[PDB]
């Protein structure tokens, strides 16, 4: 069975760093596009970042741009989010999701989602 498991969510004082780590089982990142998506407490799903199957970071949300770094290890099938200079607005539930780029039809849409990991900025 395919599954995505996020881990790394924790309290961070403002100005800190946390690394989130989404582990994938049942498929390879070498053929799927991977996404980080967040829901702020009280608000709606925001697309944080997107990485291609070919390894390039196509997008970073304007707020996260310059502070977050998204990467992947295709040997362990892991996705990483290095968050630096965390502000209180970045407290949220984080989600790793998966979609596809088809040669014929194109981008498909996020069909596999993780459990989620909570990142809370305190004081």
């Amino acid at each position: 069975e395919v599954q995505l498991v996020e881990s790394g969510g924790g309290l961070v004082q403002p100005g800190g760093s946390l690394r989130l780590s989404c582990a994938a089982s049942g498929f390879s990142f070498t053929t799927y596009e991977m996404n980080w998506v967040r829901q702020a407490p009280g608000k709606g799903l925001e697309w944080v970042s997107h990485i291609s199957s070919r390894g390039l970071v196509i997008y970073y949300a304007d707020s996260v741009k310059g502070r977050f770094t998204m990467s992947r290890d295709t040997a362990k099938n892991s996705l990483y989010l290095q968050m630096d200079s965390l502000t209180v607005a970045d407290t949220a539930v984080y989600y790793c999701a998966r979609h596809y780029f088809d040669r014929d039809w194109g981008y498909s849409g996020m069909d596999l989602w993780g459990q989620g990991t909570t990142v809370t900025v305190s004081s």
Binding site: T30, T31, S53, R54, G55, Y100, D102, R103, W105, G106
Partner: protein, 387 residues
Amino acid sequence: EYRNWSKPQCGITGFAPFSKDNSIRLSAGGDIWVTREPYVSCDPDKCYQFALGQGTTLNNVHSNNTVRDRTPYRTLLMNELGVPFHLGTKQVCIAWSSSSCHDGKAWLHVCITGDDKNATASFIYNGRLVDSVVSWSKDILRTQESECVCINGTCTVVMTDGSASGKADTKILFIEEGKIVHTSTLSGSAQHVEECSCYPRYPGVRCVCRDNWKGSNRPIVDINIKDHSIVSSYVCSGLVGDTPRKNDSSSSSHCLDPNNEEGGHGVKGWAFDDGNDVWMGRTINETSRLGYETFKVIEGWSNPKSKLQTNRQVIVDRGDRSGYSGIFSVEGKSCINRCFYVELIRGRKEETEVLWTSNSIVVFCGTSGTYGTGSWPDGADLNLMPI
């Protein structure tokens, strides 16, 4: 022994029915491969059908969610034209992209498989793995999905690598007995080139491709099989053949450049030239892959601004599903005939009453005689077939 395609082109007034496989109808009872992206190619004796199978049959648990195109399990299946892809089908290489030639002596298969970043193209000739190439642009390496063309033992394969909407590196590979003897980078006015339908326009090869980035007209690649010189342009007819495309009244070509009209995606198709006129085929619906019609545009290969049609045929009806189509040439007694195949796609992402995606094929060939009307859909009823 070698094949040189030296004869003239046969007089074509239209196309006559040639073959039908009824794959989906037989899949309801019986074990039939789940395929897509088919084509046809002929050795000097008979004709063969090829497809990219998803490594499973249709009445199978593994048939669920087979809409993807790049999996480690897709292989290239080859039968004689007419024999459905039953469980005795020989699968001739690991490939999620493919192309195939016959140079008059042995079959050549170009098979692309592997990771999306680092992909491998194996060149198999006469049952040997003769050569191999890696991605140059470190992207989805892909090829014609139809037959390639050999002249005097030198076969030509068009391979694209790079972004689907942007500048991609397209190369033309000249292969001799499976060994790549030369490689020419694409040069000319065609910006995006994909999934080319090539035919031997002696003394060279002419390919009509798809523009998946900025045009609804089709690109043209003229390969000089001898000097290895490439020329690129666009199909000049005012009735463009890609889909999505604008309605007949509002369409336009440029004969050199993309038209910048509804050019976001496209479908693999074909076209060839009869003097100044162009024989072409496209889907009847301008936005979905529904139906399939072929016709002739008068002065369509030389004049943009021509929308005069004639000799129209309806191969598949307006409300019936079609897909990829392509051309292949057959050596006749005194001339070279042009045939085409249409892929009739059925299943998920457009019909949500099944969990699988598969295709059937319908094959027509040009004729100098007369012909009637008809419509040859797939015919499968998915409301009764197993999910």
